[PDB]
Design an enzyme around this catalytic site. Structure first.
Site, PDB file in Angstrom:
ATOM      1  N   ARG A  82       0.823  -1.199   0.000  1.00 55.59           N
ATOM      2  CA  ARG A  82       0.000   0.000   0.000  1.00 55.59           C
ATOM      3  C   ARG A  82       0.865   1.260   0.000  1.00 55.59           C
ATOM      4  O   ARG A  82       2.089   1.178   0.106  1.00 55.59           O
ATOM      5  CB  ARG A  82      -0.932  -0.018   1.216  1.00 55.59           C
ATOM      6  CG  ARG A  82      -0.218   0.084   2.559  1.00 55.59           C
ATOM      7  CD  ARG A  82      -1.132  -0.364   3.712  1.00 55.59           C
ATOM      8  NE  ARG A  82      -2.483   0.184   3.606  1.00 55.59           N
ATOM      9  CZ  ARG A  82      -3.573  -0.532   3.336  1.00 55.59           C
ATOM     10  NH1 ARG A  82      -3.479  -1.846   3.155  1.00 55.59           N
ATOM     11  NH2 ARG A  82      -4.759   0.063   3.255  1.00 55.59           N
ATOM     12  N   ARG A  92       5.955   2.711  -1.790  1.00 56.77           N
ATOM     13  CA  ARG A  92       4.925   1.835  -1.245  1.00 56.77           C
ATOM     14  C   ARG A  92       5.552   0.892  -0.222  1.00 56.77           C
ATOM     15  O   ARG A  92       6.774   0.854  -0.082  1.00 56.77           O
ATOM     16  CB  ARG A  92       4.283   1.040  -2.369  1.00 56.77           C
ATOM     17  CG  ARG A  92       4.029   1.865  -3.610  1.00 56.77           C
ATOM     18  CD  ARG A  92       3.455   1.001  -4.699  1.00 56.77           C
ATOM     19  NE  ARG A  92       2.422   0.117  -4.170  1.00 56.77           N
ATOM     20  CZ  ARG A  92       1.154   0.465  -4.004  1.00 56.77           C
ATOM     21  NH1 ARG A  92       0.739   1.691  -4.322  1.00 56.77           N
ATOM     22  NH2 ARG A  92       0.294  -0.406  -3.519  1.00 56.77           N
ATOM     23  N   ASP A  95       8.062  -3.145  -2.369  1.00 55.46           N
ATOM     24  CA  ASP A  95       8.734  -2.626  -3.545  1.00 55.46           C
ATOM     25  C   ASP A  95       9.239  -3.756  -4.425  1.00 55.46           C
ATOM     26  O   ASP A  95       9.929  -4.665  -3.960  1.00 55.46           O
ATOM     27  CB  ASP A  95       9.923  -1.746  -3.147  1.00 55.46           C
ATOM     28  CG  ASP A  95       9.495  -0.428  -2.536  1.00 55.46           C
ATOM     29  OD1 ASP A  95       8.740   0.318  -3.193  1.00 55.46           O
ATOM     30  OD2 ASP A  95       9.922  -0.135  -1.398  1.00 55.46           O
ATOM     31  N   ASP A  97      11.292  -4.062  -8.168  1.00 47.16           N
ATOM     32  CA  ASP A  97      11.916  -3.386  -9.297  1.00 47.16           C
ATOM     33  C   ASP A  97      12.526  -4.407 -10.219  1.00 47.16           C
ATOM     34  O   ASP A  97      13.218  -5.302  -9.767  1.00 47.16           O
ATOM     35  CB  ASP A  97      13.027  -2.445  -8.845  1.00 47.16           C
ATOM     36  CG  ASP A  97      12.491  -1.165  -8.257  1.00 47.16           C
ATOM     37  OD1 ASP A  97      12.174  -0.250  -9.040  1.00 47.16           O
ATOM     38  OD2 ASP A  97      12.382  -1.091  -7.019  1.00 47.16           O
TER      39      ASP A  97
END
Ligand SMILES: [Cl-]
Length: 158
Positions: A82, A92, A95, A97
């Site tokens: 969230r 958030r 995470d 990536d």
């Protein structure tokens, strides 16, 4: 194609948030987890001393296109994490990536690969080096040389 994904998390109890995230990554269509690094521990940014962050790297074999993989990482971030209420613009609570996507270089509006700052981030490079010590970036730079030359401090384990 082997994608390398950075996972972070400091919210609630990091160990079970991250474990749920790994399960989600593994359920991504046309994809399977090859290996996951150790879980590492990094201190929060700022003096106020927030919770400790849990960092890891995942090698994911996938036949998805890079932007399709992005779609799933974004979906997982939405479902599993969230926004910070006092910092909606802030990171958030979970995470993901995409650090690397095979040997591809991608500069679209939604997606930049290699991750634009990873070569300056020990917390991304060390877990990656654990699962992929012989990695070479698309520009020909060797992961091992980056860690060696730039002399990043090792991370403590979770
Ligand atoms: Cl590169």
């Amino acid at each position: 194609t082997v994608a390398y994904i950075a996972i972070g998390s400091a919210l609630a109890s990091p160990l079970e948030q991250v474990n749920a995230a790994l399960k989600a990554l593994g359920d991504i269509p046309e994809s399977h987890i090859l290996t996951v690094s150790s879980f590492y521990r990094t201190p929060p940014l700022g003096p106020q001393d927030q919770p400790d962050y849990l960092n890891a790297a995942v090698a994911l074999e996938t036949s998805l296109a890079p932007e399709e993989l992005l779609n799933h990482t974004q979906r997982i971030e939405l479902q599993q994490g969230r926004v910070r209420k006092a910092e909606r613009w802030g990171p958030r609570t979970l995470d993901l990536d995409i650090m690397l996507f095979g040997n591809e270089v991608i500069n679209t509006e939604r997606l930049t690969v290699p991750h634009y700052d990873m070569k300056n981030r020990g917390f991304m490079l060390w877990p990656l080096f654990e699962i992929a010590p012989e990695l070479v970036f698309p520009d020909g730079e060797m992961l091992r040389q980056i860690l060696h030359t730039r002399a990043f401090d090792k991370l403590n384990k979770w």
